[PDB]
Structures are given as structure tokens and as C-alpha cells.
């Protein structure tokens, strides 16, 4: 949870791409430069999209990160995110993340993006009832039962999945922006009671 003594970036962050991300974030000259826990505590935001990162090992020592942009990497294991208790905005599109149990304790998370991860089973997301924004487009999802617990969602994208049953969305009265194009939907009866929708996209269903 903390680095005890000043330590070279490249020792804390074994993924060479992620070490370079941290070096640039802290405006250091080299990944051989040492950092203190106090310097790591100064990091509020990491922008590391499209960076060829395979592991974010070391990120556990960044307790104050609130915004994390990791779209377009080579992640499979997000366990090092487990205890990032202040994370509010998390972008993980275009990785291959399937085990969502590491997200359970991100109790301050407001926005989660997991587009284009090949995901089918989203039952782990039941553990994030405080979410306000959730982006799951371009996956292999059929069963959205668990999203009925996410009663604070105001923006939800499920576009380009394999959903036919949207009954679990019926109770989500705070939804404002709902993106359901490119699914298998023919029956929207359960959405009839949503009163706060501003955007509801349903283009290009494939009935079945």
C-alpha cells in the first residue's frame, strides 16, 4: 500500500510502458529516477490510452488517483486497481478484461467504461450500485439482470451487444441517456415508465 523509501520508477512499475507513463506524469528525466510515496500521492490523473500497457502493477501505490484513462492497452488483470478507493472515472475500453471482481471495492466510482473487451458476463458489476455512467458497448452481453441494482445510473450504453431482454432496466428511473442500438430488441414495454429519458437510441436491431 505504500513505498517505504524512495525507489526507482522502473522497480515499482515493472511494465516498461507503464513506467514511462509514470515518468512522464511526474515530469521525471528517466525511469531510473527514484520517487517517494509523497510524489506518488500527488498523482490525481493518469492519461495512458493507446500505450501498449500489459500490466498496471505498481498503481496500487497511487492512493489519490481519481481519473484513470487506460483505453486501448493489453490489460487482462486489473487486480492492482482493487484498493484505489478514490477512483471516480475509469476508462478501460479495448482491453481483454473479464474478471470484474477487482472492481467491487471502487466505492467512489462514478463512471466506468469497458467497451470492446469481449465481455459476456457482467454480473460483477452488481457491486457498483453508486455508478452514474456505464459504457458497455461492443461486447457479447446478453443478460443485464444485475444492472437493475444500479439505481443511480443516468447514462448507460449497451449498444452492439446481444440483448433481447431489457426488463431489468424498468426500475432505473434516473436514466437520462440510454444507448441500445445493434442488439436483438423487439419489446420496449418495460421502458414505458422511464420518465427522465432525453436520449434513447434503438437503431439497427436484429430481431431474434
Amino acid at each position: 500500500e505504500t513505498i517505504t523509501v524512495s525507489t526507482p520508477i522502473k522497480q515499482i512499475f515493472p511494465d516498461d510502458a507503464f513506467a514511462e507513463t509514470i515518468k512522464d506524469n511526474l515530469k521525471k528525466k528517466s525511469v531510473t529516477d527514484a520517487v517517494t510515496q509523497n510524489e506518488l500521492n500527488s498523482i490525481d490523473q493518469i492519461i495512458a490510452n493507446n500505450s501498449d500497457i500489459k500490466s498496471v502493477q505498481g498503481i496500487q501505490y497511487l492512493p489519490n488517483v481519481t481519473k484513470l484513462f487506460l483505453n486501448g492497452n493489453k490489460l487482462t488483470d486489473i487486480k492492482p486497481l482493487v484498493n484505489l478507493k478514490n477512483l471516480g472515472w475509469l476508462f478501460l475500453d479495448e482491453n481483454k478484461i473479464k474478471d470484474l471482481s477487482s472492481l467491487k471495492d471502487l466505492k467512489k466510482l462514478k463512471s466506468l467504461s469497458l467497451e470492446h473487451n469481449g465481455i459476456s458476463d457482467i454480473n460483477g458489476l452488481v457491486h457498483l450500485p453508486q455508478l452514474e455512467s456505464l459504457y458497455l458497448g461492443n461486447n457479447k452481453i446478453t443478460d443485464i439482470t444485475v444492472l437493475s441494482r444500479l439505481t443511480k445510473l443516468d447514462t448507460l450504453s449497451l449498444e452492439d451487444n446481444q440483448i433481447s431482454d431489457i426488463v431489468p432496466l424498468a426500475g432505473l428511473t434516473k436514466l437520462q441517456n440510454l444507448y441500445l442500438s445493434k442488439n436483438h430488441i423487439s419489446d420496449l414495454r418495460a421502458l414505458a415508465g422511464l420518465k427522465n429519458l432525453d436520449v434513447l437510441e434503438l437503431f439497427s436491431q436484429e430481431a431474434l
Epitope: 490510452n49 483505453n71 441517456n177 436520449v199 437503431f203
Partner: nanobody
Framework: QVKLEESGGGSVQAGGSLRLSCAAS????????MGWFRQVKEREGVAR????????WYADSVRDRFTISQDNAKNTVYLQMNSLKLEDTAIYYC????????????????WGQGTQVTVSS
Amino acid sequence: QVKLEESGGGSVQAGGSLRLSCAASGHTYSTYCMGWFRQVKEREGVARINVGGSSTWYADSVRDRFTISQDNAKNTVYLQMNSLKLEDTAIYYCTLHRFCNTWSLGTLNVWGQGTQVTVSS
């Protein structure tokens, strides 16, 4: 791929008004968030609208002086800046994202080139 065509700005006397416009092309979105950030310090959101929807957002410092509106068919938004104040002097940038809650972050947006607005007196 997405072009943001911006117009408007310049110099205006305090208490006066200016209108900015921004037109998006090359996107595929039925609905999307478009509006302005400004920068003097760190950039900050000013106002946005969901083009193809209706929802708007304003920064507290401009509410009730600035009005944002859309022409959905022309993929254009307009910022009517009334009651201009010295504190409004900044570079204003049109900016776009499919999703308004992400638009607010800036980081993932399409960014225009920006226009200088200077308020005098």
C-alpha cells in the same frame, strides 16, 4: 475524422455580447455532446448541449448570462454570450464527445482550434 468549424470571438466591451458557433462534420452520431471549454490556468467547461437531445449544462459562473442552443439538422451549436464580464476573457474552444458525462472531462474529446475572446473595461 471529425471537423469542428468555429466562428466568432474577438474584442468586446464589458456588458456587451458575442455569439460563437461551432459546426461538426465527419461524425456518425445520432446524438452527441457539443459545446465550449475556455482557458486563461487550467481549461474549464463553459456550456454544452446534447445535439439530437435537449439537455444542457452551464458552468455556475456563466449561468443566466450565456445561452447555448442547437440546430440539429445543421450539426451546429451556438453560444450567445451576454452581459460579458472581464473574467470571461479567455480562449474558447468548441469540443465534442458522444457522451455528455465524458465530455465534461475534456481528455477524450475532439477539440477545435479555439478563438480568443477579450472583454475590455
